[PDB]
Symmetry: D2
Subunit: 143 residues, 4 copies
């Protein structure tokens, strides 16, 4: 449909790979966080620097379900795509897919995050404009 | 009935902690992998050096589900526990819990791994002794 | 002078920073390796995938001297610049500077790497065209 | 003369090892930091949780020099040793050696750290008891 997707690419690097030149799974999760960071800065107008600084806020992960479909290797460029599954006042759920350079699905992950005060930890609502911006990404078929 | 639970501890270190003031979630996954590594070396008699070396094998992750219950902080010692959920010929599913120093649950991850040939990638059966050792960790109540 | 420099930029991310939102030093070294990887792929026509794959080669570090001049923080974009200090048949020495968005020097590192066979470790000469390409980056004032 | 050397061990893990088949060098620096962390907690009575917490302090690195002597591999246990080179009021320089299981030198790093106020960055003197504890590790022969 026309609900939004957020997309970008990531190069599989030497730092990401095991002795076989295949991606070590915790490293996918560094890739995933970088992608969420990007989405916040580019699409939601609430970059992590502002959020964790002046904002005294965070978006820690509550739940994460990841399926590793096919391996990725040193030197491949992967494409990352994000949709929003569910959006509350404080919590939000995204679905992220990583696809290889010939369009093969590499991993699919559904991730629930919660907006919190970091001084000290306690849930809080998302900023209104942020929640409004996320609403455009919502794919009602996903949940 | 009779069973076994594999358990050890890990210190939350500076390298693990982020600008929200807690453990950065990919870092939990490095701690998870370290724990699985420990299990293989210390309980299953199939250390990763041997497995990935002469063994020409690995145990890549097929599926992860992680529930983050409460945050962890610099300087805390966490307890890690492993139980086996399901055991096939090649695939195996484990449940790992991380607990805080007063036993508060921090995270629970259900993870399916698959034994593979690394030369080159293709599923293969676990060694007989290894599967037999893993069977002792089976938690029937999780089935 | 007109000897060459290799340049690119890198965003300081959440994964790079400590609890204060300042870069944790081992993370600079992940940034440094990524930059060398880039230089090999873009400038030297010998990407890490080809090098570690078909090439059965590596460029492990022999020596590294790094001065941390000023701290870097979450959300800053740093500029990375590389020059070649010294070039042998197998060994090569680079100097890398990271500068902040307002041109302040953040870190300066002189790094000696050695071309090796990875099956199994043993020095070898650089490929001729690679060594030729590095020669253009040589700043004879540096050593 | 009378002195002390701080020493402990570390296992080389899957997470540390790369596509050249050895420890990936930034990973040595995470192991270095862990070791300094250990020194502070176990020898100097100033653990990082306390230091960075109530203490509003840190010990960022100003200078690194690392000589990589021989590679390390998955499954090896390394020995880490610390000696103090130089001790000022705020700054301190340490020499750390990593050795293999048959005592072969793997790397030697000379590192200068500086005690700082984190609220906000500005050098400050080490606590008196901490400096006194560090003095016991001084290796006059390295001066
Ligand atoms: Cl590609
Ligand atoms: Cl909510
Ligand atoms: Cl939600
Ligand atoms: Cl593909
Ligand atoms: Cl029984
Ligand atoms: Cl199976
Ligand atoms: Cl299974
Ligand atoms: Cl607890
Ligand atoms: Cl067998
Ligand atoms: Cl049971
Ligand atoms: Cl900037
Ligand atoms: Cl040479
Ligand atoms: Cl050289
Ligand atoms: Cl600057
Ligand atoms: Cl004496
Ligand atoms: Cl001083
Ligand atoms: Cl000093
Ligand atoms: Cl040795
Ligand atoms: Cl004092
Ligand atoms: Cl002495």
């Amino acid at each position: 449909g026309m609900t939004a997707v957020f997309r970008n690419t990531v190069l599989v690097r030497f730092k990401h790979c095991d002795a076989a030149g295949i991606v070590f799974y915790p490293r996918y999760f560094e890739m995933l966080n970088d992608f969420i960071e990007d989405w916040f800065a580019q699409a939601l107008d609430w970059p992590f620097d502002a959020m964790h600084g002046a904002g005294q806020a965070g978006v820690p992960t509550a739940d994460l379900h990841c399926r590793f479909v096919a391996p990725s290797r040193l030197g491949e460029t992967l494409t990352r795509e994000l949709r929003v599954v569910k959006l509350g006042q404080s919590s939000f759920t995204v679905q992220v897919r990583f696809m290889g350079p010939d369009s093969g699905l590499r991993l699919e992950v559904t991730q629930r995050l919660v907006c919190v005060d970091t001084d000290k930890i306690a849930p809080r609502p998302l900023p209104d404009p942020v929640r409004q911006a996320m609403a455009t990404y919502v794919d009602e078929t996903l949940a």
